[PDB]
Design a protein around this ligand. Structure first.
Ligand SMILES: *[C@@H]1O[C@H](CO)[C@@H](O[C@@H]2O[C@H](CO)[C@@H](O)[C@H](O)[C@H]2NC(C)=O)[C@H](O)[C@H]1NC(C)=O
Ligand SMILES: *[C@@H]1O[C@H](CO)[C@@H](O[C@@H]2O[C@H](CO)[C@@H](O)[C@H](O)[C@H]2NC(C)=O)[C@H](O)[C@H]1NC(C)=O
Ligand SMILES: *[C@@H]1O[C@H](CO)[C@@H](O[C@@H]2O[C@H](CO)[C@@H](O)[C@H](O)[C@H]2NC(C)=O)[C@H](O)[C@H]1NC(C)=O
Ligand SMILES: *[C@@H]1O[C@H](CO)[C@@H](O[C@@H]2O[C@H](CO)[C@@H](O)[C@H](O)[C@H]2NC(C)=O)[C@H](O)[C@H]1NC(C)=O
Ligand SMILES: *[C@@H]1O[C@H](CO)[C@@H](O)[C@H](O)[C@H]1NC(C)=O
Ligand SMILES: *[C@@H]1O[C@H](CO)[C@@H](O)[C@H](O)[C@H]1NC(C)=O
Ligand SMILES: *[C@@H]1O[C@H](CO)[C@@H](O)[C@H](O)[C@H]1NC(C)=O
Ligand SMILES: *[C@@H]1O[C@H](CO)[C@@H](O)[C@H](O)[C@H]1NC(C)=O
Ligand SMILES: *[C@@H]1O[C@H](CO)[C@@H](O)[C@H](O)[C@H]1NC(C)=O
Lengths: 262, 189, 251, 49
């Protein structure tokens, strides 16, 4: 039942997308609001299968008043065979989360869930969901005449990684579309320059990647070399300076890096 | 409700406000030194003398005028209050973002009311009027058009998101060099 | 000499260089240990290189999708061109072939557009990498947390597949202590302020120490500069400021 | 939907692109704001000179 006051001549109330949203019933001239049957996305929360097989399920932006009455009678397009609802069904702003035990404790995010809810595989091992902690609380002992001065230090070598280039691909448009077919190529000729501007765009990308590496690395005019003796005040640099023994003069850390990405 | 969902942000506005409160409390009680190591308490007056010395003004200038800078700072904050609370357009840059996204979505939805050459823009209408051999062509025209519209929408979203990412990287840069420390870059902060 | 370079870059973050020379062995050991830790952090944690790995995957993934798009009918009778070529005469095979071209062209345009956007993102990243190599390797940067967390000391580049890795050597203060501070000191009515550093007290005496490493020095007219007089600074504390000339001009 | 199945992965890569956008926005806020390890609090008394 609705209150959309149809005037006696109107029959089909309409929605922005031109889908009918209300209808006057032909037999009893009464108005009916038509709401699409409750639907949503189903996301699956899993710790990496190489660790465990038990998962949780998030029904997105769906009050799970509907989720049980839908599955226990099998109203689902998912149509599970092995599905189980616990008493641990839990409600978040992101939707209803089934199979993850609500936990009062708060830890750092592991698997984002949204609205400040984060899930993780934790202990009997099980899937838990909590309100992620923002970091350790810490009040600073501030006073109007107190200053805290360090008496020591730490030389910390952080590492930071940036992409620079990406594989210089190139698509042969006419062979991709029309592989070895003169007939299909003739048909393609009617589309004009649709197929050459793609090649031009990809060529632009590739030459740009060469430019990227040039800019990032070729910032030195001359190729310097460290002297034979490593008398740098006690600092050990053998770990990052190139090693003579390996075919491409790449240092140890460069070798690990080249062994990871592959 | 055409499959057009809006997922919630990960950090609720509460958690974000907690973050900014953290950055504020650190900046006040400790200075820039909480961006390097652990926060080191320091009287805020001496912090201000630090940051005066950081711009070529000897710190005695601060201490001998402390009341006067304090009043100018408080008055400036009040002016910011009023400048916001009166001028609506002050937040245009955020507002624009919202509108753009909203606008795009509207366009997307409106694109469901176009024939694209089909006999009708309503799928179930064709489903209820033609047999499959003929309804197939109409339906195909609708898919081709709706797919083209959806691809257009996604591409505009990709570009707008890249722009927003540029803006967020600049915002992160400003919070790093501008809140967590004092920047010598002219007119950057 | 690299030692003097390190003293340079200590002076560049407000720590007087004597700090380096008197601790040289200790910084040397911490640097070597830190490099070893980077070794192990890489050699164990696989996800450490995610940002590069992701790039590769994305490109590879896109290509796969592109190729897979050759197995779709798009409404044609078959996804194989030569099949239609060998089954229909041109007047009818033309329509099927046209549907295949329209679809494959749409797929290719989609692929190229995603590539354009991803390449723009990578170009942004490479411009940032060039900026970091310029202001971060070739020099010492005062921009907070732009190069490393903590005060910057230096940075060393390393290659990596389709990317670069910086080892950011940064100075992070470690073991702090509370002291009673004071913005100024009344000696004779004058108000001596720190020339560099802060005034601190261990509870009984007043020292002037540099900003970032507690090294207390007796307060001297060479440590401080006079300005104004007592009654204007808020929080100024009484003490005596030693002046070097008097013992000579007394003996 | 059956008609759509003939277009192949045209419809899943859109979902993937939008998912990439969304997770990127979470990354944006993370980067901008979560730059502090510990949650500080100002002391009870506001004696900031
Ligand atoms: C400054 O800190 C360093 C380490 O951060 C201290 O050096 C350590 O001293 C202990 C003695 O208690 C030794 O057992 C360690 O082997 C030392 N470490 C290194 C790397 O040498 C140093 O003592 C601290 N200095 C002060 C004055 O506190
Ligand atoms: C610098 O560090 C390297 C290690 O990174 C040292 O090489 C090691 O030397 C010891 C002998 O002192 C050997 O037992 C190790 O097997 C070596 N490791 C490697 C990986 O080769 C090098 O001697 C150090 N040099 C200085 C001057 O400190
Ligand atoms: C504060 O530091 C000063 C100087 O470092 C200390 O004064 C010296 O204290 C030692 C014993 O700890 C005496 O032998 C010296 O004669 C003192 N020097 C002078 C000039 O008086 C002082 O004891 C320290 N106070 C505290 C509470 O740590
Ligand atoms: C620092 O020393 C001066 C004098 O050496 C102190 O000034 C005295 O202040 C009291 C309170 O107003 C007056 O009654 C005296 O007449 C002042 N003495 C002089 C010589 O003018 C001052 O109080 C001291 N500071 C602190 C914090 O104790
Ligand atoms: C993943 O599981 C395999 C067993 O198949 C094991 O060899 C490996 O160590 C596991 N990986 C991790 C990171 O635990
Ligand atoms: C779900 O429905 C219940 C009533 O069945 C209601 O109290 C609750 O607020 C609803 N949840 C949301 C998020 O609207
Ligand atoms: C969290 O603690 C409260 C008591 O403060 C309790 O009522 C609630 O049930 C707890 N939550 C869970 C999930 O156990
Ligand atoms: C400084 O004093 C406060 C007073 O409570 C204390 O909490 C803090 O730990 C002290 N700082 C150090 C470095 O000991
Ligand atoms: C610090 O605050 C106390 C009150 O707790 C006050 O007595 C003192 O004068 C103040 N000193 C400074 C330097 O602000």
């Amino acid at each position: 039942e609705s209150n959309k006051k149809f005037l006696p001549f109107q029959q089909f109330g309409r929605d922005i997308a031109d889908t009918t949203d209300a209808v006057r019933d032909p037999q009893t001239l009464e108005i009916l609001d038509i709401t699409p049957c409750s639907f949503g996305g189903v996301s699956v929360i899993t710790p990496g299968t190489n660790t465990s097989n038990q998962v949780a399920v998030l029904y997105q932006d769906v009050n799970c008043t509907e989720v049980p009455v839908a599955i226990h009678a099998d109203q689902l397009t998912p149509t599970w065979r092995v599905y189980s609802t616990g008493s641990n069904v839990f409600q978040t702003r992101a939707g209803c989360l089934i199979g993850a035990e609500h936990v009062n404790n708060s830890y750092e995010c592991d698997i984002p869930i949204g609205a400040g809810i984060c899930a993780s595989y934790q202990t009997s091992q099980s899937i838990i969901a909590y309100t992620m902690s923002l970091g350790a609380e810490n009040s600073v002992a501030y006073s109007n005449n107190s200053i805290a001065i360090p008496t020591n230090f730490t030389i910390s070598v952080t590492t930071e990684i940036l992409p620079v280039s990406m594989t210089k691909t190139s698509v042969d448009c006419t062979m991709y579309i029309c592989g070895d077919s003169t007939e299909c190529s003739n048909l393609l000729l009617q589309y004009g320059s649709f197929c050459t501007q793609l090649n031009r765009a990809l060529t632009g990308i590739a030459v740009e990647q060469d430019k990227n590496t040039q800019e990032v690395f070729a910032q030195v005019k001359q190729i310097y070399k460290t002297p034979p003796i490593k008398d740098f005040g006690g600092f050990n640099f053998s770990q990052i300076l190139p090693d003579p023994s390996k075919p491409s003069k790449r240092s140890f850390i460069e070798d690990l890096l080249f062994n990871k990405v592959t | 409700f055409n499959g057009l969902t809006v997922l919630p942000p990960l950090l609720t506005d509460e958690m974000i406000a907690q973050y900014t409160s953290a950055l504020l409390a650190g900046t006040i009680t400790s200075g820039w030194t909480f961006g390097a190591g652990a926060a080191l308490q320091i009287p805020f007056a001496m912090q201000m003398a630090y940051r005066f010395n950081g711009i070529g003004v000897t710190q005695n200038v601060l201490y001998e005028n402390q009341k006067l800078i304090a009043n100018q700072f408080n008055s400036a904050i009040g002016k910011i209050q009023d400048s916001l609370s009166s001028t609506a357009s002050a937040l245009g840059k955020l507002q624009d973002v919202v509108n753009q996204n909203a606008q795009a979505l509207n366009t997307l939805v409106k694109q469901l009311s176009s024939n694209f050459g089909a006999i009708s823009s309503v799928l179930n209408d064709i489903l209820s009027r033609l047999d499959p051999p003929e309804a197939e062509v109409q339906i195909d025209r609708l898919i081709t058009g709706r797919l083209q519209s959806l691809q257009t929408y996604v591409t505009q979203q990709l570009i707008r998101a890249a722009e927003i990412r540029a803006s967020a990287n600049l915002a992160a840069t400003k919070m790093s060099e501008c809140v967590l420390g004092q920047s010598k870059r002219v007119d950057f902060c | 000499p690299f030692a003097m370079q390190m003293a340079y870059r200590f002076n560049g973050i407000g720590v007087t260089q004597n700090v380096l020379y008197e601790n040289q062995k200790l910084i040397a050991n911490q640097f070597n240990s830190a490099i070893g830790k980077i070794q192990d952090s890489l050699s164990s944690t696989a996800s450490a290189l995610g940002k590069l790995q992701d790039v590769v995957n994305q490109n590879a993934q896109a290509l796969n999708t592109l190729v897979k798009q050759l197995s779709s009918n798009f409404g044609a009778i078959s996804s194989v061109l030569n099949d239609i070529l060998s089954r229909l005469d041109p007047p009818e095979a033309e329509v099927q072939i046209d549907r295949l071209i329209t679809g494959r062209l749409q797929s290719l345009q989609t692929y190229v557009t995603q590539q354009l956007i991803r390449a723009a993102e990578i170009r942004a990243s490479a411009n940032l990498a060039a900026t970091k190599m310029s202001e971060c390797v070739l020099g010492q940067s005062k921009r907070v947390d732009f190069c490393g967390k903590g005060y910057h000391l230096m940075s060393f580049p390393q290659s990596a597949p389709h990317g670069v890795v910086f080892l950011h050597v940064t100075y992070v203060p470690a073991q702090e202590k509370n002291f009673t501070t004071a913005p100024a000191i009344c000696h004779d009515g004058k108000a001596h302020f720190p020339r560099e550093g802060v005034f601190v007290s261990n509870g009984t005496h007043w020292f002037v120490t540099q900003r970032n490493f507690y090294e207390p020095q007796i307060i001297t007219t060479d440590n401080t500069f006079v300005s104004g007089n007592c009654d204007v600074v808020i929080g100024i504390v009484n003490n005596t400021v030693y002046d070097p000339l008097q013992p000579e001009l007394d003996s």
